[PDB]
Write a protein that binds this ligand. Structure first.
Ligand SMILES: CCCCCCCC/C=C\CCCCCCCC(=O)OC[C@H](O)CO
Ligand SMILES: CCCCCCCC/C=C\CCCCCCCC(=O)OC[C@H](O)CO
Ligand SMILES: CCCCCCCC/C=C\CCCCCCCC(=O)OC[C@H](O)CO
Ligand SMILES: CCCCCCCC/C=C\CCCCCCCC(=O)O
Ligand SMILES: CCCCCCCCCCCCCCCCCCCC
Ligand SMILES: CCCCCCCCCCCCCCCCCCCC
Ligand SMILES: CCCCCCCCCCCCCCCCCCCC
Ligand SMILES: CCCCCCCCCCCCCCCCCCCC
Ligand SMILES: CCCCCCCCCCCCCCCCCCCC
Ligand SMILES: CCCCCCCCCCCCCCCCCCCC
Ligand SMILES: CCCCCCCCCCCCCCCCCCCC
Ligand SMILES: CCCCCCCCCCCCCCCCCCCC
Length: 230
């Protein structure tokens, strides 16, 4: 409670934990193999985020990085979370549209580059270089978003209508919420430092719960996760 952002870390921990438990109960009894994949991916996402939020709340997922002549508090646990949860979210989208394996690997690999370069930027001690890493990570994000809007055209013709509808909604949610991340980083403690760490933590908490629990609620309530069966 010594850090003003503790309240948002505590709320994030609670919301990710509750979301995990809800998805775990909801997926109980699901037998359809396709739906099992979506429940597994979508329950793992907030479960991982729960552990990383808790690690930030308890102080383990925080480190001090010297730059700008200050000791800057950097929550590195965010990147350990996003390293696993962001490819999993992309996998949900890719499995919805029956994406080719080449496209899945492109997405997951670009996503690993996005998170890894974000982590390097977050830990870099030369201030100006932090924004070089931010730019590379943003380029990887833009590549991901490009693939989500222009890499699935060969699947549109054979796509079930409920699949197309649910995918279109999730793609819109993804573009809006994922785009906000580089902006928060750029203006917050890890970039220019014009927004204080407590407001940055609040912003990432709203984004993360929306991108994980909100996204999951939309996906797991849709008919698109079940194979077409009589
Ligand atoms: C924006 C994100 C909403 C955040 C939810 C966190 C808490 C977990 C969410 C619990 C959802 C409960 C729910 O919506 O239940 C409806 C369904 O009909 C019952 O099976
Ligand atoms: C996956 C969970 C992340 C564990 C990585 C780790 O603990 O190593 C970093 C070091 O402990 C922190 O300074
Ligand atoms: C001057 C800098 C030049 C280098 C900047 C690289 C830094 C990372 C930036 C973007 C990641 C790009 C991810 C690359 C993954 C592409 C995979 C691919 O090409 O997949 C196509 C295939 O047809 C299946 O869709
Ligand atoms: C590339 C697209 C443009 C966005 C990049 C902006 C980099 C901003 C870096 C300025 C932050 C340092 C200023 C400060 O010390 O407060
Ligand atoms: C320091 C204040 C501690 C009390 C905050 C309690 C907030 C819990 C409910 C938050 C509402 C979010 C629900 C979405
Ligand atoms: C101090 C608050 C700790 C976060 C709540 C723990 C998660 C509860 C999920 C049920
Ligand atoms: C506590 C850290 C949890 C991270 C492990 C998550 C592993 C994900 C496996 C599938 C991707
Ligand atoms: C200054 C040192 C700060 C430590 C940063 C460590 C960040 C590691 C995040 C990558 C996650 C790797 C997961 C390994 C499996 C567990
Ligand atoms: C870089 C690490 C990749 C994490 C994998 C998470 C699971 C999604 C692809 C199978
Ligand atoms: C303080 C100025 C640093 C800005 C560098 C940003 C690099 C963007 C493209 C490379
Ligand atoms: C059809 C597309 C639905 C629009 C998605 C709404 C975006 C709002 C994100 C928050
Ligand atoms: C200290 C006053 C400067 C704070 C400006 C914050 C602007 C961020 C909005 C984007």
């Amino acid at each position: 409670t010594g850090r003003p952002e503790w309240i948002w870390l505590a709320l994030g921990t609670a919301l990710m934990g509750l979301g995990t438990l809800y998805f775990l109960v909801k997926g109980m009894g699901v037998s359809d193999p396709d739906a099992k994949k979506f429940y597994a991916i979508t329950t793992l996402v907030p479960a991982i985020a729960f552990t990383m939020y808790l690690s930030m709340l308890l102080g383990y997922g925080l480190t001090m990085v010297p730059f700008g002549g200050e000791q800057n508090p950097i929550y590195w646990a965010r990147y350990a979370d996003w390293l696993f949860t962001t490819p999993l979210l992309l996998l949900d989208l890719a499995l919805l549209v029956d994406a080719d394996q080449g496209t899945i690997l492109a997405l997951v690999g670009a996503d690993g580059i996005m998170i890894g370069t974000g982590l390097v930027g977050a830990l870099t001690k030369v201030y100006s270089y932090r924004f070089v890493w931010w730019a590379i990570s943003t380029a990887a994000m833009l590549y991901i978003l490009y693939v989500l809007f222009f890499g699935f055209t060969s699947k549109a013709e054979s796509m079930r209508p409920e699949v197309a509808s649910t995918f279109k909604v999730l793609r819109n949610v993804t573009v809006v919420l994922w785009s906000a991340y580089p902006v928060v980083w750029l203006i917050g403690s890890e970039g220019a430092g014009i927004v204080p760490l407590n407001i940055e933590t609040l912003l990432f908490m709203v984004l993360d719960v929306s991108a994980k629990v909100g996204f999951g609620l939309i996906l797991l309530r849709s008919r698109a996760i079940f194979g077409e069966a009589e």
